Amino acid sequence: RDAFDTLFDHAPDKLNVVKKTLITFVNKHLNKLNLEVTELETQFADGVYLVLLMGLLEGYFVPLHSFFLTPDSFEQKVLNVSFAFELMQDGGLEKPKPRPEDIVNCDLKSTLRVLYNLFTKYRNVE
Amino acid sequence: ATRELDELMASLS
């Protein structure tokens, strides 16, 4: 039980503050590739934006053969998320708490945790 | 925006 469990159980009227702030953050970087997020609930589930964001935050071009740009199955989406998690750990982050499947399943708490830990680590990336 | 998220997360911890 972390602060995200406390947030959803005890202060759920503050979720909008978290959402907005993480949206601004992801868009600051994703906008460099002409990409945009309006909705954290759905738009990270296929793993594509999460992979590209790692390239953006650690400062490398992610080769397209290393993932699924247009995932057509649940398993291909899982593999994208697993690959972004791998790149997070390559950057020094500890193993994400959620399963890759939780992200594909649009679990919002899981999506918030992943994005917040990027937010905290990469706060200073211009 | 940014500070408010940090403050919130800290107070929930």
Numbering used by the authors:
A (entry chain B): 247 to 372
B (entry chain A): 1 to 13
Authors' text:
The adaptor protein paxillin contains five conserved leucine-rich (LD) motifs that interact with a variety of focal adhesion proteins, such as α-parvin. α-parvin (Olski et al., 2001), also known as actopaxin or CH-ILKBP (Tu et al., 2001), is part of the ILK signaling complex (Tu et al., 2001), plays an essential role in adhesion-dependent PKB/Act activation (Fukuda et al., 2003) and in the regulation of actin organization (LaLonde et al., 2005) and Rac activation (LaLonde et al., 2005; Zhang et al., 2004). It belongs to the highly conserved parvin family that shares a common architecture composed of a variable N-terminal region followed by two CH domains (Olski et al., 2001). Our results demonstrate that full-length α-parvin contains a single LD binding site, formed by the N-linker helix, helix A, and helix G of the C-terminal type-5 CH domain.
To elucidate the molecular basis for LD recognition by α-parvin-CHC, we cocrystallized α-parvin-CHC with peptides representing the high-affinity ligands LD1, LD2, and LD4. The refined structures include residues 247–372 of α-parvin and paxillin residues 1–14, 141–155, and 262–274 for LD1, LD2, and LD4, respectively. All three LD motifs bind to the same binding site on α-parvin-CHC formed by the N-linker helix, the N-terminal part of helix A and the C-terminal part of helix G, which is consistent with our results from chemical shift mapping. Surprisingly, however, the orientation of LD1 is reversed compared to LD2 and LD4 in the corresponding crystal structures. Despite their antiparallel orientations, however, the binding modes of different LD peptides are very similar. As the result of a slight rotation around the helical axis of the bound peptides, the character and position of side chains facing α-parvin-CHC is largely preserved, the same hydrophobic pockets are occupied, and a similar amount of surface area (∼500 Å2) becomes buried. In addition, two positively charged residues (K260 and R369) of α-parvin-CHC are in close proximity to negatively charged residues of the bound LD peptides. Note that these electrostatic contacts involve the conserved aspartate D+1 of the LD consensus in the case of LD2 and LD4, whereas D+6 and E+8 are utilized in LD1. Consistent with their similar binding modes, all three LD peptides, irrespective of directionality, impose similar conformational changes in the N-terminal region of α-parvin-CHC, whereas the protein core remains virtually unperturbed. In particular, residues 248 to 264, which experience conformational change upon complex formation, are similar in all LD complexes with RMSD-values of 0.28 Å (LD1 versus LD2), 0.23 Å (LD1 versus LD4), and 0.15 Å (LD2 versus LD4) in 16 equivalent Cα−positions.
